[PDB]
Amino acid sequence: TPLLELKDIRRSYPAGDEQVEVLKGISLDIYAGEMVAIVGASGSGKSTLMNILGCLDKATSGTYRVAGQDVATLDADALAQLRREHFGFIFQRYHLLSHLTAEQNVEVPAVYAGLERKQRLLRAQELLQRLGLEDRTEYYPAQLSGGQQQRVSIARALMNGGQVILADEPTGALDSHSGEEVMAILHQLRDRGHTVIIVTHDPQVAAQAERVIEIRDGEIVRLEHHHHHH
């Protein structure tokens, strides 16, 4: 029974009596413990769907339920708590603060789940070690490669649990070697029960998912299952 549920999710930005219709009725269910890919062109509306999935954006109409909870009914604070209960985020860019260490960057999400620095630190390190950065815990971003910075950003995504990992083109700025490393960590996390949603233009990255949703213009056009040789 599905951890995330969307029915008829629409999105339009107001513009006079005219509106800008980005997503035009997307119904879709995602389960715990799977890697899903959402693939489509720039313009497809795959970005908005990501932001909606992450609750960094409100659907204009439709019903988005996350672990049962319909999200439209919640205040900014309670939405924020839910988002922290369930979601982690990585992107093509790494979004690290240049004047914070790797360990420090990893702590950041936990700050606002209210846990104090001693517990926070201990978890950040465990998580950076888990990602093969035991000896990089006090390195600054400018001392690290893309590849490493993205592992830092993954460890940051696990900080509040990261039950659902939303990855936007997480290998877009990476060489073929760093890409595989990133993918293999994402398969590993999905192996350990995490859900991983990955958005890409590239159907080769998509092909690695267990299921592949394609959006053309605010609308799903194709769902595919894949079983794996990862």
Side-chain angles (χ1 to χ4, degrees), residues 16 23 39 59 75 78 82 97-98 116 128 141 143 176 178 192 194:
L23 299 182
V39 49
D75 49 71
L82 186 72
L97 286 74
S98 273
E116 215 146 25
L128 278 170
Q143 291 146 23
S176 82
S178 285
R192 302 192 179 184
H194 291 83

Side-chain angles (χ1 to χ4, degrees), residues 4-9 26-29 49 53 63-64:
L4 312 182
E5 306 178 65
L6 295 62
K7 300 223 217 297
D8 287 320
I9 289 296
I26 280 156
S27 326
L28 157 64
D29 307 304
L49 179 54
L53 290 166
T63 311
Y64 180 39

Side-chain angles (χ1 to χ4, degrees), residues 16-92:
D17 228 357
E18 216 153 295
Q19 35 159 303
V20 317
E21 309 146 9
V22 182
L23 299 182
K24 304 189 205 77
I26 280 156
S27 326
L28 157 64
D29 307 304
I30 285 85
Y31 300 81
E34 68 166 343
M35 173 161 304
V36 173
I38 299 179
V39 49
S42 43
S44 72
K46 74 194 163 133
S47 287
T48 310
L49 179 54
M50 271 284 288
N51 296 323
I52 285 156
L53 290 166
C55 303
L56 304 181
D57 192 1
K58 277 301 214 217
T60 17
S61 55
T63 311
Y64 180 39
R65 297 204 193 77
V66 160
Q69 184 57 57
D70 178 339
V71 300
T73 77
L74 302 167
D75 49 71
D77 290 15
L79 186 68
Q81 197 176 354
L82 186 72
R83 183 171 53 239
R84 259 138 40 204
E85 262 145 28
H86 297 284
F87 294 108
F89 301 85
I90 63 177
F91 299 92
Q92 184 173 313

Side-chain angles (χ1 to χ4, degrees), residues 101-160:
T101 56
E103 100 211 300
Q104 285 173 320
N105 279 284
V106 176
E107 290 180 29
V108 172
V111 173
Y112 299 96
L115 87 94
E116 215 146 25
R117 66 190 157 70
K118 45 254 65 175
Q119 296 116 280
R120 227 161 55 218
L121 178 66
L122 185 55
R123 179 161 176 71
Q125 297 164 325
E126 282 165 354
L127 289 176
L128 278 170
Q129 183 187 236
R130 181 177 163 180
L131 277 103
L133 300 179
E134 199 193 3
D135 300 310
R136 310 270 149 180
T137 57
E138 273 104 299
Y139 283 53
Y140 292 95
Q143 291 146 23
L144 305 166
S145 49
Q148 291 168 321
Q149 284 182 247
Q150 192 66 288
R151 280 179 269 151
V152 172
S153 190
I154 294 168
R156 185 182 44 192
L158 284 15
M159 188 67 194
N160 288 323

Side-chain angles (χ1 to χ4, degrees), residues 155-171:
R156 185 182 44 192
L158 284 15
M159 188 67 194
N160 288 323
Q163 176 188 38
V164 178
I165 306 301
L166 308 172
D168 197 317
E169 277 294 3
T171 78

